[PDB]
């Protein structure tokens, strides 16, 4: 029979087989279920898709056709859930959000 | 030559799926690689802890789903759970 990738069987773009191998060899459990790598790949694919779509939108609003680390930082820090997920994460060459305290601006 | 075995090609496939005409730089590629590795480690480790707590020796989709509920905030958890359930259901039908 012709070999069908488990990713294609699950309708995914992430490698189900590689995820299964990493789970088995990663010192997590004595055994790994059949659907665990599928679930893991689906979650990872969803997360990367969401971040990539937000970063691509940020790049497009900046009139750029290539995602750079700054666009990833803008995508993450402008989303409260993504910022909470990656609160303790530093992104290289990502800069900081443009934020100036109100009291520092001139009054008149 | 050591076959570093990254996630670059799959992330590029996802990017072309969501933004057909948008490329990505090498630095952003490495950053997204690190993000995928970090999230995989977090979810796998927490699922392993869940399995250990209940005196189970296997990691199933239930452990992964509970891990996803525990570490992802807000609607991120809901949508990741939906995606994982859909993928597992489709895979079971082969």
């Amino acid at each position, epitope marked *: 029979a012709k070999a069908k990738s488990r990713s294609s069987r699950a309708g995914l773009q992430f490698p189900v087989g590689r995820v299964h191998r990493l789970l088995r060899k990663g010192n997590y459990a004595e055994r790994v279920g059949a659907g665990a790598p599928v679930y893991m790949a689906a979650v990872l694919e969803y997360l990367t898709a969401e971040i990539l779509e937000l970063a691509g939108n940020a790049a497009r609003d900046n009139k750029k056709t290539r995602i750079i680390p700054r666009h990833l930082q803008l995508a993450i820090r402008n989303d*409260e859930e993504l910022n909470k997920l990656l609160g303790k994460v530093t992104i290289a060459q990502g800069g900081v959000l443009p934020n100036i305290q109100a009291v520092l601006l001139p009054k008149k | 030559r050591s076959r570093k075995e990254s996630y670059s090609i799959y992330v590029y496939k996802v990017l072309k799926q969501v933004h057909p005409d948008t490329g990505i730089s090498s630095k952003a590629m490495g950053i997204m690689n690190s993000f995928v590795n970090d999230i995989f480690e977090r979810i796998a480790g927490e699922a392993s802890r869940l399995a250990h707590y209940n005196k189970r020796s296997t990691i199933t989709s239930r452990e992964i789903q509970t891990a996803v509920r525990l570490l992802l905030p807000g609607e991120l958890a809901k949508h990741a759970v939906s995606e994982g359930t859909k993928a597992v259901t489709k895979y079971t039908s082969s």
Partner: single-chain antibody
Amino acid sequence: EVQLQQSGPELVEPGTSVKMPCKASGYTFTSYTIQWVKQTPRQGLEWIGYIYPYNAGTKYNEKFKGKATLTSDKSSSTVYMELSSLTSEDSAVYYCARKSSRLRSTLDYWGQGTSVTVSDIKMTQSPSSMHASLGERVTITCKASQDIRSYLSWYQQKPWKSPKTLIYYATSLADGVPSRFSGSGSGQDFSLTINNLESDDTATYYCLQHGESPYTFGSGTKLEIK
């Protein structure tokens, strides 16, 4: 649990300004954008804009730019909308709806509506109005102009009532919606199907897209039972 309170009807003379609140409770206030939608008998539902209380970020419809101004108050979990220079064609119902920052998410919970009376992607719904008996099958087509990657949602609006979400992401059932409602389609063709009908199902159904920056609604479909 989640509830978005709104003020009552306000009578305003033309040329003045008005403001209505959207006091929200039952959830983490800063995690969800508040989207404002106006509904008129001659245009149907129309998207105005949203505000993100997390970072005060806003985004307005081009045809409502300048006319509407959105503000957020983190202390009281309230969002206000200001209309300046109220022109005669502003006597309509203005809705404030909750929507998460996730792209897959839609306008899930709505305010009751403040009936204010004064003194792009074209989203096409094929069946304008239809009739059905107590247990037949109905199907509503919502062919779109451009391509949207399954960022389509279906809403049910009882007369003189706020719309209720049925389908989001073009296939996913919303919370509390029975499995009788079933969405399908992707790209430019979308469909909403109701298998078993009830007297409750007598309402107007709209399909909303949020794949591109100006969100657009369908013309609606008045569905009548028996």
